[PDB]
Paper text:
Mitoribosomes are composed of a catalytic rRNA core, encoded in the mitochondrial genome, and an outer shell of mitoribosomal proteins. It encodes 43 proteins, half of which are soluble, varying in length from 59 to 1344 amino acids. To characterize the T. thermophila mitoribosome, we determined its structure using cryo-EM at 3.30–3.67 Å.
The resulting 4.0-MDa model consists of 92 different proteins, including two bL12m dimers. Of these, 46 proteins are mitochondria-specific, while 27 are newly identified including 9 Ymf-encoded with previously unassigned functions. In the large mitoribosomal subunit (LSU), we identified a protein binding two iron-sulfur clusters via CDGSH motifs, mL107. The resulting β-sheet, therefore, consists of three different proteins assembled to make a bacterial-like uS3 NTD. As a result, the buried surface area between the SSU head and body is almost doubled compared to that of bacteria: ~40,000 Å2 vs ~21,000 Å2. In contrast to the prediction, only four bL12m copies arranged in two dimers fit the density. The local resolution of 3.2–5.0 Å in this region allowed modeling 150 residues arranged in eight helices, which belong to a nuclear-encoded protein that we named mL105.
Numbering used by the authors: 1 to 262
Write the structure that this text describes.
RNA sequence: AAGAUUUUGCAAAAUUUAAAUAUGAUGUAUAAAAUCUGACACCUGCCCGGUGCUGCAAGGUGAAUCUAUUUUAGUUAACGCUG
């Protein structure tokens, strides 16, 4: 879960920085794993609809309990695995009934740690006195806390903070009407209910922000192809195309203005 | 590769079609789309008059429809109908 500063034995390893993907601690399974068709920015009729997208050597799917309401036993963590699209880690979880699943892990966890889901107040977890990375109801939480994968009361799935190093800070708590006012990563505010649910602690890989690819072939092997300027392009192909590289206004090929107030 | 600006808070914006839909993505602002420059180091200065873009209280110009008011023509023996 740490950065690697490489010694400049090549041009591309001079600035590169990447995370230890922890292959020794990834016991791979065939229970949660599918590999679907790679969608290269196309529809079913073959036509490109979103550009700059292609082959992905790291295509997979791993089914996850974003919602951990269905069991309350205590658990451990046997192993780990990595996700690419959000650059987040996960970890298996073995419940005391020998059950199994994957979960979103929080920052500060690792093999050997414990985790559970909580129906009742905090004093009634005699196991698992530490509380990080646990599925909990927002009312049954401290004054100060931060949530990372939120499931609203009027909803099945989670729609906020699912990316790396994110959270949802609390601004207020209104237990009267059971209505919380949480902050998003941007800064906007949203009404949520304390009957809703979420995880505790920021999601894994806080340190993706301190990354440098250093090689074009690290994106090509994800499904990120080569972009092209609208200025090298011919006037047929793009509304900037031509010999002049200056342009009032600054536009998009389907026709609309990108830069506003500008 | 890297840097900056602009849009998008989730049945997301953008994209495809006449439409259902397809899709972005079973991804959630450390994400997605567009745009100009182009490793790294030092720097990236003054000006919002002009054009362009965005926004727009009050004010000015501003279409039909509804309503009210005013003015007026033709025709009929008459009431009246109509414009
Ligand atoms: Mg096309
Ligand atoms: Mg792109
Ligand atoms: Mg380019
Ligand atoms: Mg040319
Ligand atoms: Mg043409
Ligand atoms: Mg043209
Ligand atoms: Mg020239
Ligand atoms: Mg540079
Ligand atoms: Mg420019
Ligand atoms: Mg001005
Ligand atoms: Mg204007
Ligand atoms: Mg106006
Ligand atoms: Mg006005």
């Amino acid at each position: 879960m740490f950065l690697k500063n490489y010694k400049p034995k090549t041009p591309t390893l001079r600035f590169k920085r990447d995370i230890f993907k922890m292959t020794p601690f990834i016991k791979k399974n065939n229970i949660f794993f599918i590999k679907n068709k790679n969608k290269s920015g196309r529809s079913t009729k073959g036509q490109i609809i979103v550009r700059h997208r292609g082959a992905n050597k790291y295509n997979k799917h791993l089914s996850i309990n974003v919602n951990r309401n269905q069991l309350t036993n205590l658990a451990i963590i046997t192993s780990l695995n990595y996700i690419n699209k959000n650059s987040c880690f996960i970890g298996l979880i073995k419940y005391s009934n020998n059950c199994l699943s994957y979960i979103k892990l929080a920052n500060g966890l690792f093999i050997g740690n414990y985790t559970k889901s909580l129906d009742k107040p905090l004093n009634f977890s005699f196991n698992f006195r530490n509380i990080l990375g646990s599925f909990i109801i927002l009312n049954l939480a401290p004054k100060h806390s931060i949530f990372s994968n939120l499931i609203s009361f009027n909803k099945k799935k989670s729609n906020y903070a699912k990316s790396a190093g994110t959270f949802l800070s609390i601004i207020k708590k209104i237990k009267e009407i059971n209505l919380f006012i949480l902050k998003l990563p941007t800064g906007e505010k949203k009404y949520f209910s304390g009957d809703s649910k979420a995880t505790l602690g920021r999601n894994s890989n806080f340190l993706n922000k301190f990354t440098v690819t250093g090689k074009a072939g690290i994106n090509r092997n994800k499904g990120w192809r080569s972009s092209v300027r609208g200025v090298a392009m011919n006037p047929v192909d793009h509304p900037h195309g031509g010999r002049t590289k200056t342009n009032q206004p600054e536009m998009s090929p389907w026709g609309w203005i990108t830069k506003k107030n500008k």
